[PDB]
């Protein structure tokens, strides 16, 4: 009946040498951690230590070339750090970035291990830099290594190769890297909700559309729920969970749930444009706790309003600890385009999931 928590201030050391106001700030994690103290949640959790992922562990999802290049940045001079970062889509690199990315991944490995050994029931990981845009062979979108994807493979490496892992990605952006890593895999079900705007929203690829259902034996195991033309919030996320996420997840019957928990869909975010409330995130967390014998690991991804992410993630930890879940209005009408999105995903995935037929 225990909730784990991992946070290590060393992950603040990754920083933008050329724009100290870049939104992926060191204080994202320290603000969330401080809010857990203010709300007296920290002392209710079992503290799980951070550790470095090993290069062998990184190779569970990433190419040797990509690992080597990011590793090479540890000792680079500033001009070379600037040039390397510019080779990617939306990446800044400091001499601490590689080690911080290793700590983010290793923290989540230790948390998954604590869950799978039964030392804790569930856990929260207050880590940065984020991971879900990172691909097998490249960094992208503030992300170096795909922490959630690596954690799924790490869990499989200690319990069972075919362990059924559900990754729910509620960051406002599509986790292109996670989708691609598992696109042909039926042991890892990837479900993403994300702003799409017909491809106008970052990362600006049709890979995020509802018709990308997976490949080969992975067909049906990639669920994209894309939002267009509306300021989405609690009603739309609750509806997507009710009609799509939970029916599919229950049929898949995961043995471990990882949440790619960005908080950039939150009210107040400078980028997301959405209005999911802390109660909304608590509702989603509580729903996921009904799966996988409660084995849920919440992993910080994006989210850029420091006050919003601190309150939102803290409310998720409150749910993991067993606090009473919020009651929300399931009768509020959805934005009209959200109904269209949900119907498009249902049509795309009904061939693969009997719960949708
Ligand atoms: O959260 C996240 N992943 O989970 C996440 C990951 C990466 C970005 C990067 N990015 C893309 C972006 N987003 N909103 N417009 N564009 C630019 C665009 C213009 C015209 C057509 C298409 C795209 C930045 O543009 C960017 C780059 C450096 C510093 C600050 C920013 C910010 F977004 F804040 F302004 C954003 C979010
Ligand atoms: K997402
Ligand atoms: K998959
Ligand atoms: Zn995001």
UniProtKB/TrEMBL annotation:
Q: Which residues form a coiled coil?
A: none
**Where would you say this protein principally sits, based on its record?**
other
| GO biological process terms on file | angiogenesis; chromatin organization; definitive hemopoiesis; hematopoietic progenitor cell differentiation; mitochondrion localization; negative regulation of cellular component organization; positive regulation of cellular component organization; regulation of microtubule-based process
Q: Which GO terms describe its cellular component?
A: axon; centrosome; dendrite; nucleus; perikaryon
Gene Ontology molecular function? actin binding; potassium ion binding; protein lysine deacetylase activity; transferase activity; tubulin deacetylase activity; zinc ion binding
Which key words tag this protein in UniProt?
Actin-binding, Cell projection, Chromatin regulator, Cytoplasm, Cytoskeleton, Hydrolase, Metal-binding, Methylation, Nucleus, Phosphoprotein, Repeat, Repressor, Transcription, Transcription regulation, Transferase, Ubl conjugation, Ubl conjugation pathway, Zinc, Zinc-finger
Tell me where in or outside the cell this protein is found: Cell projection, Axon; Cell projection, Dendrite; Cytoplasm, Cytoskeleton, Cilium basal body; Cytoplasm, Cytoskeleton, Microtubule organizing center, Centrosome
- Quick check: keyword Repressor in the entry? yes
- Listed binding positions for Zn(2+) are 171, 173, 264
Provide the transmembrane region boundaries.
Answer: none
> Family, per the entry?
Belongs to the histone deacetylase family. HD type 2 subfamily.
Q: What is this protein called?
A: Protein deacetylase HDAC6
Chain's gene name: hdac6
Q: Indicate the span of the full protein covered.
A: 290 to 646 of 929
């Amino acid at each position: 009946p225990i909730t784990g928590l991992v946070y290590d201030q060393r992950m603040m050391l990754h920083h933008n040498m050329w724009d100290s106001h870049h939104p992926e700030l060191p204080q994202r994690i320290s603000r969330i951690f401080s809010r857990h103290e203010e709300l007296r949640l920290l002392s209710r959790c079992h503290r799980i230590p951070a550790r470095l992922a090993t290069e062998e562990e990184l190779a569970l999802c990433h190419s040797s070339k990509h690992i080597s290049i990011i590793k090479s940045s540890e000792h680079m001079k500033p001009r070379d750090l600037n040039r390397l970062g510019d080779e990617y889509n939306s990446i800044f690199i400091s001499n601490e970035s590689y080690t911080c990315a290793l700590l983010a991944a290793g923290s989540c490995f230790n948390s998954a291990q604590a869950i799978l050994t039964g030392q804790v029931r569930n856990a929260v990981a207050i880590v940065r830099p984020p991971g879900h845009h990172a691909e097998k062979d490249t960094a992208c979108g503030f992300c170096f290594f795909n922490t959630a994807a690596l954690t799924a493979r790490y869990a499989q490496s200690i319990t069972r190769e075919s362990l059924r892992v559900l990754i729910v990605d509620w960051d406002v952006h599509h986790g292109n890297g996670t989708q691609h890593i598992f696109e042909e895999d039926d042991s890892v079900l990837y479900i993403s909700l994300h702003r799409y705007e017909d491809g106008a929203f970052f990362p600006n690829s049709e890979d995020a559309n509802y018709d990308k259902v997976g490949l080969g034996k992975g067909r049906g195991y990639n669920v994209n729920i894309p939002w267009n033309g509306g300021k989405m919030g609690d009603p739309e996320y609750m509806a997507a969970f009710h009609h799509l996420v939970m029916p599919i997840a229950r049929e898949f019957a995961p043995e471990l749930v990882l949440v790619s928990a960005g908080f950039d869909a939150a009210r107040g975010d400078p980028l997301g444009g959405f209005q999911v409330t802390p109660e909304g995130y608590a509702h989603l967390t509580h729903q996921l706790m009904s799966l996988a014998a409660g084995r849920v690991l919440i992993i910080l991804e994006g989210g850029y309003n420091l006050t919003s992410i601190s309150e939102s993630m803290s409310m998720c930890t409150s749910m993991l600890l067993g606090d009473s879940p919020p009651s929300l209005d399931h009768l509020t009408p959805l934005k009209t385009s959200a109904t269209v999105s949900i119907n498009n995903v249902l049509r795309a995935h009904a061939p693969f999931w009997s719960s949708l037929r």
